[PDB]
Subunit: 111 residues, 2 copies
């Protein structure tokens, strides 16, 4: 928030720790396009195992980034989405991404 | 920009690498409100030596984050500010920071 009482380094670090784990950025990219079922994520993310996938989603749900909704259907259907904070972190990361893209292109141009 | 051709992971890591150097987040914070002289920065950052203050500022200038302005007056003086790129990276880190803050606060209430 840039509140003067907030230690910036500690809270940058804490924020990154929720999203820096293997697959998590890819997972977030998939959920940003829209609601996803387990099988869709299994297909979209090449070489991820179901054990790794559920582990990731569990951590991300815990951290408040991913919402898991179960539908009482025949058979039940489980939807994954980004939370509001999930979307907010997606946006912060896209801004950094945009920064690093511009910077890397300047380096290539002047090298 | 989330263009089809950009790897986001690599882009994020590159941005972070420019400010992960010790002191740099703090320098960038001191420069936000505007122009700073070497002595002001020295006094604001406890334990920084002139040597590493100059080393950081030089790296941040090379990375296009910091502008170094030389004034040719009596006597000459140098002033440091953030560039538009520097401000753009600062904004992006602030959004990240805000998120960690909300997260720690939520954790604290529980």
């Amino acid at each position: 928030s840039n509140a003067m009482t907030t230690d910036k380094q500690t809270s940058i670090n804490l924020a990154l720790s929720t999203i820096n784990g293997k697959w998590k950025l890819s997972l977030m990219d998939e959920l940003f396009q829209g609601t996803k079922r387990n099988g869709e994520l299994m297909r979209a993310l090449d070489g991820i195992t179901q054990r790794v996938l559920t582990d990731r989603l569990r951590e991300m749900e815990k951290d408040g980034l991913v919402h898991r909704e179960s539908f009482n259907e025949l058979p039940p259907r489980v939807e994954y989405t980004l939370t509001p904070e999930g979307y907010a972190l997606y946006d912060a990361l896209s801004s950094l991404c945009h920064w690093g893209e511009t910077f890397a292109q300047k380096k290539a141009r002047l090298n």
